[PDB]
């Protein structure tokens, strides 16, 4: 196992979620819930106390930083902006998703423009898919032609994390399995 994922100094962006693998090693999913104070450990399929006893190459860790109000979207069957346009879990999702607040790290006076999220897309994301397209999203009957205006929007919006914002408008950080 490794801890440089959760204790990473730089996290990913939602639309460009960063995946990490772990194999030919041993993973202890119990003591993970010790360096914790985790505000979320939503879990579908089997309890981590029981899953501590087997392991393929299934060991995957997806890291990124979302919006507070949006943490509920990293869940099977949910819709919205992140689920349809950034990170879609399957319906066969067997794993866990861990989250915690991080406003003292990913927030700035004047907003933090490093973390972005996809806001438009021609079709919903198939499960476990990563789309880094930056093309002007055609909203109406008009080919845009590399120019923004009414309709034809830039698809990636910035979170602009300020500390004065509410807890829903606050940063976070997610995991996978």
């Amino acid at each position, epitope marked *: 196992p490794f801890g440089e994922v959760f204790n990473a100094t730089r996290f990913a962006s939602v639309y460009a979620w960063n995946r990490k693998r772990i194999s030919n090693c041993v993973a202890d999913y119990s003591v993970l819930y010790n360096s914790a104070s985790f505000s979320t450990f939503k879990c579908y399929g089997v309890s981590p106390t029981k899953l501590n006893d087997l392991c393929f190459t299934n060991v995957y860790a997806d890291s990124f930083v979302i919006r507070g109000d949006e943490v509920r979207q990293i869940a099977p069957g949910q819709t919205g902006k992140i689920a349809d346009y950034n990170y879609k879990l399957p319906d066969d999702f067997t794993g866990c998703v861990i989250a915690w607040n991080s406003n003292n790290l990913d927030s700035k006076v004047g907003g933090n423009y490093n973390y972005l999220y996809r806001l438009f897309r021609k079709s919903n994301l198939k499960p476990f898919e990563r789309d880094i397209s930056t093309e002007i999203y055609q*909203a*109406g009957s008009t080919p845009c032609n590399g120019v923004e205006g*009414f309709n034809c929007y830039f698809p990636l919006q910035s979170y602009g994390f300020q500390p004065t914002n509410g807890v829903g408008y606050q940063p976070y950080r997610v995991v996978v399995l």
Partner: antibody
Amino acid sequence: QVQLQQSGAELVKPGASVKLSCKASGFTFTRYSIYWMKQRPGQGLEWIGEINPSTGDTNFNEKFKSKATLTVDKSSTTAYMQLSSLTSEDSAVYYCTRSTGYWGQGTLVTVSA
Amino acid sequence: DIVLTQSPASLAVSLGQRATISCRASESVEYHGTILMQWFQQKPGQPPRLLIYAASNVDSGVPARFSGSGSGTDLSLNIHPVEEDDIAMYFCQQSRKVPYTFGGGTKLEIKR
């Protein structure tokens, strides 16, 4: 910052033509389509005719007779609209806008002898 | 030419309250998953600024106090904590069919 400096506050004799300028700053001139809007006190906002700072433009049949939109891609980074044969229904405030953010200050044209 | 009819034409609300204005369109301003509506705000003596684009998305520099809702033919602009600087005219504008059309407006004045 993103700025749309319009000229204007212009007296135009009835029946003549006028050319309103709008200089853009703080953003790349070619990535953002530019729209021109008409507002007369009493009436609401009216019509969005656009120029794509790269040839193409599109107007409204209501203005497809008195409105001619052009632009200087060069160091001007300035969008121009020419109004032709100005009647008293043409005196108003005209805005250039970027589809996002604040509009230009607005040029007030007054058609009087 | 879709006709945009705003209601009410004049709304008075108190500091901190919620203000809601609505915009009816003769036709549906929806297209292939997006509602092509925009909300503009013109303070007294200022040029209009874009508040809302694509019916429900907020533009940069606009506080979260403004929200956009509705569907296809009937749209709504909401202000959850009305602050003292919101005194302005509010225009709805459509963009599914050229010509782009505007609404009549809505003067928002504040009770004190």
